[PDB]
């Protein structure tokens, strides 16, 4: 872990760095976007000059024939129209490899990761990952994949997707190795027009076991902060779309009787469910008092907007005036809270809400039941080991320009 | 297309086999239930059932009498009433809950609490 590392890239004082204590330098080419909430990871175009260069320590130039290594990192790849997309070529986004394409190299093809490994002789190896188009919800594209590959010289190379273990090939026809001075993140000869993003890369001067890959996998992000559908922190005052991670074909609806309905099949495209569809929601913190960022942490108090119109906000709010165990989620077209807040919580990329009388009495998990949204306790004694322990999971869709559906 | 058959008039002590023929779906992704209504009261749940796992559940005020059961093809409910109060005379609904959504049951439902309802069959326990 840190102490293999040999590379690390993070963001300090508008510029990247390396902190892994070899002193490596980063260097910005022409206009690379930083995500204002992360600015850890960055995007870089390929319709203008865009590209981040790293020059390696003399030391950590890998130029063994013997010594096991490992590479890491996030990557984001948009498929704006699912169509554009479609064309059958390889092009490059990392290059760590010499003039006599010696080294490695990460590049991309249609919903395709490309991992190459090539020697001072010319004997290259290769490993792939193609998660094909969507089938209902796609858990690859446009959002950020962990990409892992460990290499063992006196062994197998291993590509790993997420943390999961996924084409191994061995390497033992390989000889000596002498990659790159450079390590270039740059889209070269993409056929079309696009950007990619790329977050936490790191160089491991051994090849990395499996549960050092999944704390790697589980840690990199902020454990702490929650996360929306594509991976990025979830935000204060930004619309978003819902979607039950136990029924990812539907969508939630508003009704004229003020509450929500749950029995809304979502619309395909080909084989992708259509994202943007159903009510919009906005978070907004209860006690603002001015504290720090925008981004929605772990035991929150917040409220949680239904959005009508772009400027009429309509507090969400349980109703408990029924004999029902479980409360409908209702829509306050008055603007009364109804004297609740809403505590946010997550496991992994899943969001919970729960819904919570301000007297400290809690009135339960955001799940649905039946046909209509609801909010009920029995999610606290069954989040796991149950056929319906999802039901109160949920993931906040953001129209971006990455995911295009007309 | 939730159809229900079989109630009528019987006399204290009698029998009745009420089948529930349902279009569109199967049990296996739908626990079932029937549900009771007095003229003068509230919906009254009186039985459930899942068909993955064969756990049924009974009101207490009817179990021994009422035994729901499910057919191996899953298109068809079945209660089969035995013992019959008077108190039984009631409007019998077929009801059909997303068996993903919280499994809690209320004794007195609203309309929310389960996907599809059927059209109701009517069973009277009087003598004349």
Redesign the interface.
């Known amino acids: 872990i840190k102490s293999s590392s040999v590379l690390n890239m993070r963001y300090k004082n508008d510029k990247y760095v390396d902190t892994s204590g070899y002193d490596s330098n980063i260097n910005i080419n022409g206009d690379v976007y930083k995500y204002p909430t992360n600015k850890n990871q960055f995007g870089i175009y390929n319709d203008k000059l865009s590209e981040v260069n790293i020059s390696q320590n003399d030391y950590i130039i890998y130029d063994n024939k013997y010594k096991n290594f490992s590479i890491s990192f996030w990557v984001r790849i948009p498929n704006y129209d699912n169509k554009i997309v479609n064309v059958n070529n390889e092009y490059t986004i990392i290059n760590c490899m010499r003039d006599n394409n010696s080294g490695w190299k990460v590049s991309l093809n249609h919903n395709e990761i490309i991992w190459t490994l090539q020697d001072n002789a010319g004997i290259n190896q290769k490993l792939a990952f193609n998660y094909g188009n969507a089938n209902g919800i796609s858990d690859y594209i446009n959002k950020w994949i962990f990409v892992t590959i460990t290499n063992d010289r006196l062994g197998d190379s291993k590509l790993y997707i997420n943390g999961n273990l996924i084409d191994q090939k061995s390497i033992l026809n390989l000889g000596n190795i002498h990659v790159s001075d450079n390590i270039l993140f740059k889209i070269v000869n993409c056929s079309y027009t696009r950007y990619i993003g790329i977050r936490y890369f790191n160089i491991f001067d051994k090849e990395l076991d499996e549960t050092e890959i999944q704390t790697l996998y589980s840690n990199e992000p902020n454990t702490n902060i929650l996360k929306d559908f594509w991976g990025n922190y979830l935000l204060y005052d930004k619309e978003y779309y819902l979607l039950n991670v136990l029924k990812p074909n539907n969508f939630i609806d508003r009704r004229k009787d003020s509450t929500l309905s749950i029995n809304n099949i979502r619309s395909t495209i080909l084989l992708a469910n259509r994202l943007y569809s159903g009510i919009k929601v906005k978070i907004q913190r209860v006690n603002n008092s001015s504290t720090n960022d925008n981004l929605v942490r772990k035991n929150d108090q917040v409220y949680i907007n239904f959005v009508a119109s772009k400027t009429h906000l309509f507090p969400l709010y349980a109703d408990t005036a029924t004999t029902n165990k479980e409360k409908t989620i209702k829509i306050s077209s008055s603007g009364n809270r109804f004297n609740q807040v809403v505590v946010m919580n997550s496991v992994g990329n899943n969001c919970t809400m729960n819904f919570k009388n301000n007297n400290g009495n809690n009135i339960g998990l955001l799940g649905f039941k039946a046909d209509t949204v609801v909010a009920s306790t029995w999610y606290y004694t069954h989040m796991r080991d149950h056929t319906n322990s999802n039901g109160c999971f949920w993931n906040f869709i953001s129209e971006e320009h990455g995911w295009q559906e007309k | 297309q939730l159809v229900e058959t079989g109630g009528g008039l019987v006399k204290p002590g009698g029998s009745l086999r009420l089948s529930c023929v349902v279009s569109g779906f199967t049990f296996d992704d739908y626990r079932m239930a029937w549900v009771r209504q007095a003229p003068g009261k509230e919906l009254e749940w009186v039985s459930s059932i899942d068909s993955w796992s064969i756990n049924t559940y009974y009101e207490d005020s009817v179990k021994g009498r009422f035994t729901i059961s499910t057919d191996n093809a899953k298109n068809t409910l079945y209660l089969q009433m035995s013992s019959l109060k008077p108190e039984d005379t009631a409007v019998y609904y077929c009801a059909a ?8 049951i ?1 004794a ?3 309309k ?4 599809y309802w059927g059209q109701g069959t009517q069973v009277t326990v009087s003598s004349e």
Do not use: F
């Open positions: 809950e997303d068996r993903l959504g919280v499994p809690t209320n007195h439902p609203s929310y609490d389960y996907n």
